[PDB]
Structures are given as structure tokens and as C-alpha cells.
């Protein structure tokens, strides 16, 4: 019955295709033409957080702005005062390709994961003076890629084993899993509510998942080469794909389409991180050309660059109330760009 | 503000010791593994992610890295080697007789790490792996199975200077990327000391570099 | 299981010297700064020394200045203080104190459970007046010691550290700063306040409630202790 279903699925592709179109009168580009461009954001490096020796692969801010945790290749999860420049600790990571870093939202806990498959879980506030780590979460056969803290006790991963899980750290084992993907999965982002998430793959698909079963609630596809950094909207009902085709593709929950490209002439340069602001009209995205291109998400056109980086932004995110933003990138330092009055 | 004081004091000690940490992290070399399931690197390490092989052979702590086993698409996660002192391919010297295709694969993906933007500086050591098996084969198969315009001889020197150099004629960068060579003979000292002076001399260039020479 | 006991003291001939030592264990002492409290029989506290997290600031009191020495051995977990040519005022109860120093911190939590000395016979200050208020355990009592310069700095961190002297052991860190509370204590032990004014809003009282309480200040140089109080049963 093979090409039996392959009729039924192509009529479903077809109705939901249609679908899209009759909803998606016009690219909303042409829409947005009423709300004025940001016009040349200048961002100066009004922190320079130097202090860490290699590769920024991610940095995560925890739910007061004031801390951040930036994890680089060199093995040091390295939790920092942005307001002084000031290192609160400094842990030693047991695997040191980390290419993901957690702030969980109570404070208590991060979490790096990245190569060895494993999303270790750190006590930052015990009883004691030094910072311990809680308990590992091995399962994945494939690479880590994004840990994202649910609550306090439940770690979200997506690795290159084409599938993601939820967690439960009282007891180390999988509640769910997440297989619907065919290519390595990169980028997991979590919502604002955390009841859904999406984790994008390398096979130009991002997928949103239920969070309480394991069933792939949405599929997205655009993309022409493997997706390399997925962050939410603020408003929890959308995300934005960097790929290394040199461009960034807006997706929708409610629409299951491709919204806006982010890609110009001049550049050819893969995506390497992405994140948005408080409210979600600056999409900073660290492209490979060695310049965190802020990227106007409404607008889909580059209203600003933060290029302050000797290498390539690796990665960046704006902080809870979004002050800072801090572009660590493949150069060993992260830099604290805020708008200056 | 005394708290403040206090607070500034243990970052800078968190400073001094994170530079003391970050010294030995810039002493320590990067040898990256790559290759195919059937390269046989397991004869190299011999005598669910990496296995970190950290070792010691002449004082200087190498961490090599046993990532064969990633069984994942390499093209989304070489990125993370870019600054590394070598990087170790065993070759599949399986071509001379067993097929399954002679091994161009091999070629396939040298091709692509010679090109790729992020190894144009890393020294790629080219290692004939399963060298003892691919002599008899080549001593009792031909060589023209696969490669039909080599001329082969049915000897190990010209074996070398066949294979070795289909995948050196890839190589483009000659002035940059150094690449070595040494035949994977089992032996118990002339298998990793040979990468310890490969790896000296390309952390001297880099230090030359860095130093401005 | 973190535990801070001390020893060394306890009779001193006029015109002598003493040695006191703190021991730590069951926490990362090698990261805690340390203060040093003594006690006064019948009468409040007061602060000896100090060094920071590290030996990176020693610090010493006006009354023992240049008499006493203080210095921790980190790798060892243990506290050296040296005393010597002991005047008769030096007739009071030591109390080690641990103290780490870092955004949002717990400085001034555990506290040991104290060596006595006796011997034969231009900064702020707090008001510990009020010295007794008794209440049944079934009411609520409400503490303050009052302060002339107004507490919060730009950071915003005031630090009048909150104590409760119970009768037998060490006080427990009930908030420390004067903003956030602590570890351990429940949530009957409160603190409120503006600029200069606190209340130190306490739910209920039980057996465990009775002591006297004692306030720090770590907002200049001197680290002034609280006066004595009573339990105010």
C-alpha cells in the first residue's frame, strides 16, 4: 500500500497547503509597512565581560537579569555578576564541548549539556559554600544540543540522535520522547508557559511538541539547509530558525508556515545563535560573519549590527528584562551591549 | 559597600583562578579523530559522545578524542574543533581487496575536510590504518579494482604512493595545512610518539605565528 | 551536617595572654570570609575580628587593636587567634561566625557554639534599648535597634544582621542584611523597614523563641554588635 498512502498523504499536503495559502494572503513584510522601522539600533559594549578563555557557546541570563551563566569550550560554566563584572562561581564542567547552557527559572540549578550526551545539573545555592552538581541525565545517543529547565525538576533536551525528552531529575529517567525527526536536532527552544516546545533539526524541520504525552503536535519546513538556533517569541506561539543556508525563517503555531526570511545579498554566512528582546522587535541573531546582525523580526530587514567580535557571534540572548545582551561569541569574551542614552 | 568590597575580592580570586585554570586549558592539545566505522581506530587507542582518551606521553597531557562512535552528521558539530593542535585520520586502507565500494569514501570526506572552512590551518595527520591486512591484500588482489587508472605494482611503497596520494592530490592547501604521513606499523612507540613530534612542530608554528616570526 | 566548634579560654591572669582556634567543617570554609563575636556575661556583644574570603582583608576592633591577631589556616579548616596581654575587660563568651560574600549571599548564617574567657578583676551604634517586652506565646513581638545614617547604599543592601541569643547556645542568623531571610529559620522570623526605621516582625513565640536578640552592622568598617537584651519571655 505504498503508494496508496503516498496518494492519501499527498491529498493531506495538498488541503493543508491550501490551507496556508488561504490564510496567508500576502507575506507579512508588505503588511508592516504601518509600524516604523527601529531604524540603526547602536548598541555600545557597555559591560565588556571579559574572563573566559575560548569559545562562547552559550550563555544563558537566570530569571533576574542581574546573573548570567556563559559556557564556552574551555570547560568553565562560569556564572557572572553583568552588573560588576563579577564572577558569583565558577564551575568546572565534566564535559567540556558544552554546547548548551541552563539558568533554571528558580536559580537554584543550571545545566550544560552538549557532546557527551549527558545534561548535567548543578546545585548553585546549598547548604554548603561550593556549587555541586545534582544529578545527570544520560539516555540520549546522539549529541545534546539545548537543555531548557521546565520547572526545578524537569530538564528539557533535544540531541543529535534525531529525538528529544523530557526528564525527571528525582529519579534520572525519561517521562517522554520525542522521535519525529530525521536529522540531528539543534536548537530546542521552550515557551514562556513551558507546556510546549520546539527543537529544530538538521533536515530544514522544525517540529513543536506536547510536552505531557511525547506526540509531535506541529512540523515546519522552509529551510534549505540544517536549522541552527530556534528561540520563542515572547508570546510563546512562534520561534525563529537560523540555518546555514544564510538565512533566519519566522514560523507560527496557529499558521504551521513559513512567515519572514532574514537574508540579504551581501551576506552568505550561516546563523549561529538567535534570540529576541522583551518584546520580540529585535531578533539578534549571531551570524558566522562575525557580527551579531540584529535582525528587525517584524521587519525582516537589518536594522542594526553589534559587530564588536574578532570572531564569529556564537551565541547571545537578551536577559528576563532584556537590559543586556550579551553576544559571546567564538571570541574568548562576552560583551554586555546596552543601549546607550 | 564592605559587602561589595568582599564580593569584588572573590571574583578577583575567582580571576587568579581562572587564569590558572585557563593557562593549562591553552596548554593542552585538541587531537580530533575522524574516519569511518570500518577505519579501525580502535587499534589506535589501543596501545554515548567522545571518549576523552586524556593521556600523557612526553609530559605533555594529550586529549584524544575517541568520536567515531558520534554516528551523527558531522557537518553540524566539526565546528567545535575548530582550534585544535591536529587531527588524526586513519585511513581505509580496506580498498586494496574488500569492497564495501573500495574505500572512496574515504576520499569523499577528505575532500571535504581539506575544504572545509574551519580546517585550513589544522594539520590533518593521515594515518593507513589496518596497514598490515592491506599489504597482504594488495600482495594477493590488485589494486586496479577500484582505481582502474593507477598503476599499482602490487608492492607497499607503490600502494602508498597510489592511495595516499589520490587523497593528497585533493589536498589544496599545501602551503597551510601540513599534512603528515606515517604507515600504521603495530609497533609499541613509533605509533603515538610519531603524532607527539607531529604535534610539536605544528604547536612551534602556531607559536611562531602567535609571536609574530 | 556543618558544624563550627571553638576552644581555647576560659581563665586568664591579669596581664596574660590566650590563644583561641575555630574549627569548621561540613561546608567550603576555604570560600567563607569570618567574623568573630564576643559576649559580655549579662550584657550584649561585641566584635573582635575579622579576615575576608581568602586572608585578603584582616581587619581588627578599636579595643583589641594591635593586641589580638587573627588568621585562618584554609587548608586545614581551622581558625588562629592569638591574645595577648589580656586586659580585665577581656572577661566575656567568643562566638566563631562564618560569612560568604557574594551577590545575594548568606553572610553571618552559622555561628559556633562559643568559648568563654574570663579574666580576674568615633564609629555607629545601634540602640538596643527596650529590654524587655515578655508576651505570651500565643501574641507577637515586633525588635528594632535604630541606626543614625540611613542604611541602604546605591546597591540598596542594608545590613543590620538579625540574632536571636537563645539561652545555651549561639545565636541563629534569623535574616541577615536586613532584607532577606534566612537558612533554616522559619517563617515566623520577619523583617521590615525603610531608610532608617525596621521592624523585626515576628508571627508567633514558642519555647524556642525565647533569647535575647542581638543586631550587626557590616556597613562601615567596625562591625558594632548588639547590645544585651533579654529573652523577654
Known amino acids: 500500500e505504498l503508494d496508496q498512502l503516498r496518494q492519501e498523504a499527498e491529498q493531506l499536503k495538498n488541503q493543508i497547503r491550501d490551507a496556508r495559502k488561504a490564510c496567508a494572503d500576502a507575506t507579512l513584510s508588505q503588511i508592516t509597512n504601518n509600524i516604523d522601522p527601529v531604524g540603526r539600533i547602536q548598541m555600545r559594549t557597555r559591560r565588556t565581560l571579559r574572563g573566559h578563555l575560548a569559545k562562547i557557546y552559550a550563555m544563558h541570563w537566570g530569571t533576574d537579569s542581574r546573573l548570567l551563566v556563559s559556557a564556552s569550550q574551555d570547560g568553565k560554566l562560569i556564572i557572572w555578576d553583568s552588573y560588576t563584572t563579577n564572577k558569583v562561581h565558577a564551575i568546572p564542567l565534566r564535559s567540556s564541548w558544552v554546547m548548551t547552557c541552563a539558568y533554571a527559572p528558580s536559580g537554584n540549578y543550571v545545566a550544560c549539556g552538549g557532546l557527551d550526551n549527558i545534561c548535567s545539573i548543578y546545585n548553585l545555592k546549598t547548604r554548603e559554600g561550593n556549587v555541586r552538581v545534582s544529578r545527570e541525565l544520560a539516555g540520549h545517543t546522539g549529541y545534546l544540543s539545548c537543555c531548557r529547565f521546565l520547572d526545578d525538576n524537569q530538564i528539557v533536551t533535544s540531541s543529535g540522535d534525531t529525538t528529544c525528552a523530557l526528564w525527571d531529575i528525582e529519579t534520572g529517567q525519561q517521562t517522554t520522547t520525542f522521535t519525529g525527526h530525521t536529522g540531528d536536532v539543534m536548537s530546542l527552544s521552550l515557551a514562556p508557559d513551558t507546556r510546549l516546545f520546539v527543537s529544530g533539526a538538521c533536515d530544514a524541520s522544525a517540529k513543536l511538541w506536547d510536552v505531557r504525552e511525547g506526540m509531535c503536535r506541529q512540523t515546519f519546513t522552509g529551510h534549505e539547509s540544517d536549522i541552527n538556533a530556534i528561540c520563542f517569541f515572547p508570546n510563546g506561539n512562534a520561534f525563529a530558525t537560523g540555518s546555514d543556508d544564510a538565512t533566519c525563517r519566522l514560523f507560527d503555531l496557529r499558521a504551521d508556515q513559513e512567515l519572514m526570511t532574514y537574508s540579504h545579498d551581501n551576506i552568505i554566512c550561516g546563523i549561529t545563535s538567535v534570540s529576541f528582546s522583551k518584546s520580540g522587535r529585535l531578533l539578534l541573531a549571531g551570524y558566522d560573519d562575525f557580527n551579531c546582525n540584529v535582525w528587525d523580526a517584524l521587519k525582516a530587514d537589518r536594522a542594526g549590527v553589534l559587530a564588536g567580535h574578532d570572531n564569529r557571534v556564537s551565541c547571545l540572548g537578551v536577559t528576563d528584562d532584556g537590559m543586556a545582551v550579551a553576544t559571546g561569541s567564538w571570541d574568548s569574551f562576552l560583551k554586555i551591549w546596552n543601549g546607550s542614552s | 559597600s564592605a559587602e561589595d568590597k568582599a564580593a569584588v575580592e572573590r571574583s578577583k580570586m575567582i580571576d587568579r583562578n581562572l587564569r590558572e585554570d585557563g593557562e593549562k586549558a591553552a596548554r593542552e592539545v585538541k587531537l580530533l579523530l575522524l574516519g569511518a566505522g570500518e577505519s579501525g581506530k580502535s587499534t589506535i587507542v589501543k596501545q554515548t559522545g567522545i571518549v576523552e582518551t586524556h593521556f600523557t606521553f612526553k609530559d605533555l597531557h594529550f586529549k584524544m578524542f575517541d568520536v567515531g562512535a558520534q554516528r551523527s552528521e558531522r557537518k553540524k558539530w566539526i565546528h567545535c574543533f575548530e582550534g585544535v593542535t591536529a587531527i588524526i585520520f586513519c585511513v581505509a586502507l580496506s580498498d586494496y581487496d574488500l569492497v564495501l565500494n573500495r574505500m572512496h569514501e574515504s576520499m569523499k570526506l577528505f575532500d571535504s575536510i581539506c575544504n572545509n572552512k574551519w580546517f585550513t590551518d589544522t594539520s590533518i595527520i593521515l594515518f593507513l590504518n589496518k596497514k598490515d591486512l592491506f599489504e597482504e591484500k594488495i600482495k594477493k588482489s590488485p589494486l586496479t579494482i577500484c582505481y582502474p587508472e593507477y598503476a599499482g605494482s602490487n608492492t607497499y611503497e607503490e600502494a602508498a604512493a597510489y592511495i595516499q596520494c589520490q587523497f593528497e592530490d585533493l589536498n589544496k592547501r599545501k602551503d597551510t595545512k601540513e599534512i603528515y604521513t606515517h604507515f600504521t606499523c603495530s609497533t609499541d612507540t613509533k605509533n603515538v610518539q610519531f603524532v607527539f613530534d607531529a604535534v610539536t612542530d605544528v604547536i612551534i608554528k602556531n607559536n611562531l605565528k602567535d609571536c609574530g616570526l | 551536617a556543618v558544624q563550627l566548634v571553638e576552644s581555647g579560654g576560659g581563665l586568664v591572669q591579669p596581664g596574660g595572654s590566650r590563644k583561641l582556634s575555630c574549627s569548621a567543617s561540613?561546608?567550603?570554609?576555604?570560600?567563607?570570609?569570618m567574623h568573630w563575636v564576643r559576649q559580655a556575661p549579662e550584657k550584649g556583644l561585641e566584635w573582635v575580628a575579622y579576615?575576608?574570603?581568602?586572608?585578603?582583608?584582616?581587619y581588627y576592633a578599636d579595643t583589641v587593636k594591635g593586641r589580638f591577631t587573627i588568621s585562618r589556616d584554609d587548608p586545614k579548616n581551622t581558625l588562629f587567634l592569638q591574645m595577648t596581654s589580656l586586659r580585665s575587660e577581656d572577661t566575656a563568651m567568643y562566638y566563631c561566625?562564618?560569612?560568604?560574600?557574594?551577590?545575594?549571599?548568606?553572610?553571618?548564617?552559622?555561628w559556633g557554639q562559643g568559648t568563654t574567657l574570663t579574666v580576674s578583676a568615633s564609629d555607629i551604634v545601634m540602640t538596643q534599648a527596650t529590654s524587655s517586652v515578655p508576651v505570651t506565646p500565643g501574641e507577637s513581638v515586633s525588635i528594632s535597634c535604630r541606626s543614625s545614617?540611613?542604611?541602604?547604599?546605591?546597591?540598596?543592601?542594608?545590613?543590620l544582621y538579625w540574632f536571636l541569643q537563645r539561652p545555651g547556645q549561639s545565636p541563629q542568623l534569623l535574616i541577615y542584611?536586613?532584607?532577606n531571610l534566612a537558612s533554616g529559620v522559619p517563617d515566623r522570623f520577619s523583617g521590615s523597614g525603610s531608610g532608617t526605621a525596621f521592624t523585626l516582625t515576628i508571627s508567633r513565640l514558642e519555647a524556642e523563641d525565647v533569647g535575647v536578640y542581638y543586631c550587626?552592622?557590616?556597613?562601615?568598617?567596625?562591625?558594632?554588635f548588639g547590645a544585651g537584651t533579654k529573652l523577654e519571655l
Open positions: 561540613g561546608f567550603a570554609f576555604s570560600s567563607f570570609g
Open positions: 550587626m552592622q557590616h556597613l562601615e568598617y567596625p562591625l558594632t
Open positions: 561566625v562564618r560569612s560568604i560574600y557574594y551577590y545575594g549571599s548568606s553572610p553571618f548564617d552559622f
Open positions: 545614617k540611613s542604611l541602604l547604599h546605591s546597591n540598596g543592601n542594608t545590613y
Open positions: 542584611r536586613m532584607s
Open positions: 579576615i575576608s574570603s581568602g586572608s585578603g582583608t584582616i
